[PDB]
């Protein structure tokens, strides 16, 4: 399928524990931390918009 974490996580090697699989678990995580900082940047800007609005 077409999902951003889908296409860079290996379901196929997930019972099988290859270096590929250890690489995907690590690789996919980088997007997770990315997504969490972007969510936080959106909350900070949200109070800035609330502050200037008011």
């Amino acid at each position: 399928p077409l999902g951003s974490m889908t296409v860079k996580l290996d379901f196929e090697e997930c019972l099988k524990d290859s270096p590929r699989f250890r690489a995907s678990i690590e690789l996919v995580e980088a997007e997770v931390s990315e997504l969490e900082t972007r969510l936080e940047k959106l909350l900070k800007l949200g109070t800035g918009l609330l502050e200037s609005g008011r």
Binding site: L2, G3, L35, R38, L42, L45, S52
Partner: protein, 55 residues
């Protein structure tokens, strides 16, 4: 200051969108919602330009 505060908030919703998958609802709808937000900021800029003229 308000239009710049908004303009920076609309870039933060955009940033999610290129992170995600590029599917039809994300690709077209999520983009049409946020570009309408920037279009509205510029029109509102024309009203602060015209208020200034007025003043």
């Amino acid at each position: 200051h308000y239009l710049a505060a908004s303009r920076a908030f609309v870039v933060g919703i955009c940033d999610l969108a290129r992170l995600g998958p590029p599917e039809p609802m994300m690709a077209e709808c999520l983009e049409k919602f946020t570009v309408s937000l920037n279009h509205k900021l510029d029109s509102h800029a024309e009203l602060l330009d015209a208020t200034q003229h007025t003043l």
